[PDB]
Paper text:
The androgen receptor (AR) is the cellular mediator of the actions of the hormone 5-α dihydrotestosterone (DHT). Androgen binding to AR leads to activation of genes involved in the development and maintenance of the male reproductive system and other tissues such as bone and muscle. AR is distinguished from other nuclear receptors in that after hormone binding, it preferentially responds to a specialized set of coactivators bearing aromatic-rich motifs, while responding poorly to coactivators bearing the leucine-rich “NR box” motifs favored by other nuclear receptors. Structures of AR in complex with FxxLF, LxxLL, FxxLW, WxxLF, WxxVW, FxxFF, and FxxYF motifs reveal a changing surface of the AR coactivator binding interface that permits accommodation of both AR-specific aromatic-rich motifs and canonical leucine-rich motifs.
Finally, effects of substitutions at the +4 position were assessed in structures of AR in complex with peptides containing FxxFF and FxxYF motifs. By contrast, the conformation of FxxYF was the closest to FxxLF. Other than FxxLF, only FxxYF makes direct backbone interactions with Glu897. Unlike the facedown orientation of Phe+4 observed in the FxxFF peptide, Tyr+4 is bound edgewise into the shallow +4 pocket, making interactions with Val713, Val716, and the aliphatic portion of Lys717. FxxYF was the most ordered of all the peptides, with 12 out of 15 residues observed in the electron density. Significant interactions were observed involving residues other than hydrophobic residues of the motif. Lys+2 and Met+6 are predominantly solvent exposed, extending out over the protein surface. Met+6 is bound on top of Phe+5, while Lys+2 makes a water-mediated hydrogen bond with Asp731. Thr−3 of the peptide defines a new subsite, with the hydroxyl group forming a hydrogen bond to Gln738 and the methyl group making hydrophobic contacts in a pocket formed by Glu897, Ile898, and Val901. While previous studies have shown that complementary interactions between charged residues flanking coactivator signature motifs of coactivators and charged residues surrounding the AF-2 cleft modulated binding to the receptor, we find that the flanking charged residues are typically disordered in the electron density, with only Arg−1 of FxxLF interacting with Glu897, and Lys+2 of FxxYF forming a water-mediated hydrogen bond to Asp731.
Author numbering:
A (entry chain A): 670 to 918
B (entry chain B): 96 to 107
Write the structure that this text describes.
Amino acid sequence: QPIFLNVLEAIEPGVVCAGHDNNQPDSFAALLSSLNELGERQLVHVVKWAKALPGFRNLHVDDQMAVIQYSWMGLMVFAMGWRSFTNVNSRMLYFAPDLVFNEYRMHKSRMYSQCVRMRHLSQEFGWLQITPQEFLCMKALLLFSIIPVDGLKNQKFFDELRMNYIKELDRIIACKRKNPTSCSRRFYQLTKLLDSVQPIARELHQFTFDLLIKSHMVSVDFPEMMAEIISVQVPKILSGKVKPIYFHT
Amino acid sequence: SNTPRFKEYFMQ
Ligand SMILES: C[C@]12CCC(=O)C[C@@H]1CC[C@@H]1[C@@H]2CC[C@]2(C)[C@@H](O)CC[C@@H]12
């Protein structure tokens, strides 16, 4: 049935502005402070979106908060890549309507290499001809793609939920495909794409952590929730206590 | 909680 997709389309977050003053110079401090503010603003929408996902409330409340705190980077990068693909044909990084990165900003932000990887991800939506439905299901699955090595409060409930979202992705593929071999090829492609998000998120996790530690010395502002989650949960990822769930080796 | 701000917003 279209119920699952009806829900995902219904809860998809709308446009979010960074509040960036485009009249000011493209300095490291200004660009990163605006990216951080955008992060806080998007985090609010990720929370509301997540709480409205089918079966999400079945997870222990502490696990609900944990998975959002571990996966927000990947979720936001994936969504930004989609915005960039649909808006500027992946030509530039469309973080927000008021915060679009060109080559100069990529350099000034001091994360040019990471921006290059994000652009590559954005382009994949075009090369693979990802449909809005495939994008929506893949994004939902990203929320359930990173957990503690020791497990969650109620790991069994999480494993069941994750399995159901993989099932939904399989269904969206089999929707317009009679041949099973073509379905297998598509599923391989989509899982490969999903895996590719993790190394990018990891580089950004490292970058934002190092930035938070020296933020006072570089005049970069971090909103309250961002500073909280980056100092408490991000280090768990960087130290290996929390790891992404990869489909492929 | 180590993330009191996030938790407060989430719990609302
Ligand atoms: C998630 C955000 C903001 C939301 C988005 O569109 C993707 C983008 C990816 C880079 C992140 C940024 C939030 C702030 C961060 C984490 C900076 O501190 C360094 C990397 C930035």
